[PDB]
């Protein structure tokens, strides 16, 4: 315990392994330590480290935070095998500035700390507004199809889909920078909804199982095609493909032949349960040498996030549809939901990613809350609400206290 070996980072990127005294105060080592790295750099033929104007030499963690000059290396949480960084930090002393007349003072000061509107942002605002507009247009046109079988809904939606997609193409080909692409991506993604309901609305007669087969299919196809030629915004499109594909299977089954919805819902639940274990493998196979590795790593990470998201949506819809406060053994699906939630709540630790772990953790909580609400809306009585209210507040309270205490 009398000494510790650590790697010290120096100028332009050289890493050097050194054996330091574990108890002397850090301020005593920084000077001779600097000499050693300069000697090796000079023999290596590289440019040595130098001071610039006013400043000082400091020893910091890889995060940049400097170590307190009077404390011992063992007093701080530094262990053998860690790495540190030697750095020069410039002087911040300068004259103070004062303004007497409050009007000019407020104006000058307030203009430095905040960002004003500019033409780059202006376009993104408009692009977002047009996207919101058309998803509203398809909504009312769709609501009309739910009461009338005439061609109007498909006819008018078809032309809108064509126009939006047409405009998106010019933007995509003409783009030059990431800002331009953001505008283009927002535009293209907005075309999927009109095109989707335009096909689904074509089959005559009352709406139901037969139309559903067309809708989720073209949706899945469009999402898959877009992902191929765009190669960007991986996570969200992947989620649409998964939820679209599984719904098409259920729609086709129900349309062809199904003894009960519970049968389909139970089948979907089982499919989702096994898919979670397959998710990391699927994501990994879906994906100067350094460029290839980094590109590969982030692409893989993105697919898993999307893949996890799609499954999360399906399980809550199925689970909440399977449970029921009146049908048979009312307690059987409730406890089954509990056992199902426990796996997701526990398995969340197997992934290092923050959003991936958080979404997994959140997926369990929403199911419990959703089940209680379902059992509170129906079979309505003072006992039901009184019990549900208490449960919903106690559930997370116990969870956070056990973690923070």
């Amino acid at each position: 315990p009398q000494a510790v070996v650590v790697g010290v980072m120096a100028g332009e990127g050289v890493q050097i392994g050194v054996l330091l005294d574990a108890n002397a105060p850090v301020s005593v080592m920084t000077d001779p330590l600097l000499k050693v790295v300069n000697s090796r750099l000079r023999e290596l033929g590289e440019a040595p480290l130098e001071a610039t104007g006013r400043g000082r030499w400091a020893l910091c963690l890889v995060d940049g935070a400097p170590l307190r000059a009077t404390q011992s290396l063992t007093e701080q949480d530094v262990y053998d095998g860690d790495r540190l960084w030697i750095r020069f930090i410039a002087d911040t002393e300068r004259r103070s500035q004062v303004i007497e007349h409050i009007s000019t003072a407020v104006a000058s000061d307030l203009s430095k700390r905040f960002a004003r509107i500019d033409p780059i942002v202006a376009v993104q605002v408009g692009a977002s507004m047009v996207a919101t507009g058309v998803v509203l247009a398809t909504g009312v046109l769709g609501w009309w199809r739910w009461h009338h079988n005439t061609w109007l809904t498909t006819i008018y939606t078809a032309v809108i889909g064509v126009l939006v997609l047409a405009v998106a193409m010019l933007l995509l080909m003409r783009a030059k920078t990431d800002a331009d692409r953001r505008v283009a991506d927002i535009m293209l993604m907005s075309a999927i909804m009109p095109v989707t309901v335009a096909a689904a609305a074509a089959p005559p007669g009352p709406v139901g199982s037969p139309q559903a087969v067309l809708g989720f299919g073209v949706l899945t196809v469009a999402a898959a095609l877009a992902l191929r030629f765009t190669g960007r915004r991986l996570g969200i499109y992947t989620t649409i493909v998964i939820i679209g594909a599984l719904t098409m299977l259920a729609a086709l089954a129900r349309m062809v032949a199904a003894t009960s919805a519970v049968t389909l819902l139970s089948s979907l639940l089982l499919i989702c349960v096994v898919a979670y274990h397959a998710a990391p493998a699927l994501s990994r196979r879906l994906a100067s040498s350094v460029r290839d590795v980094l590109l590969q790593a982030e692409r893989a990470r993105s697919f898993l996030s999307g893949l996890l998201t799609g499954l999360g949506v399906m399980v809550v819809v199925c689970m909440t549809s399977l449970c029921d406060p009146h049908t048979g053994q009312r307690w059987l699906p409730l406890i089954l939901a509990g056992f199902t939630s426990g796996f997701l709540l526990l398995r969340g630790r197997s992934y290092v990613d923050r959003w991936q772990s958080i979404t997994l953790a959140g997926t369990a909580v929403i199911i419990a809350a959703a089940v209680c609400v379902r059992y509170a809306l129906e079979l309505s009585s003072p006992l039901a609400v009184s019990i549900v209210a208490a449960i919903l507040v106690l559930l997370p309270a116990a969870g956070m206290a056990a973690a923070a205490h």
Partner: protein, 50 residues
């Protein structure tokens, strides 16, 4: 009010003129008398015993 508005603007340009002169003074005085904690790193520079 028109005379008031002109008078206020004339002062601001004097303020800006004063500020530039002050910055030249800060830059010069710091160059000759640094804060005591920074002197150690300067030992190798030609500023010593100047």
């Amino acid at each position: 009010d028109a005379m008031r508005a002109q008078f206020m603007l004339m002062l601001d340009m004097l303020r800006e003129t004063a500020q530039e002169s002050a910055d030249s003074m800060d830059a010069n005085y710091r160059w000759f008398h640094p804060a005591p904690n920074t002197l150690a790193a300067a030992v190798g520079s030609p500023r010593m015993w100047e």
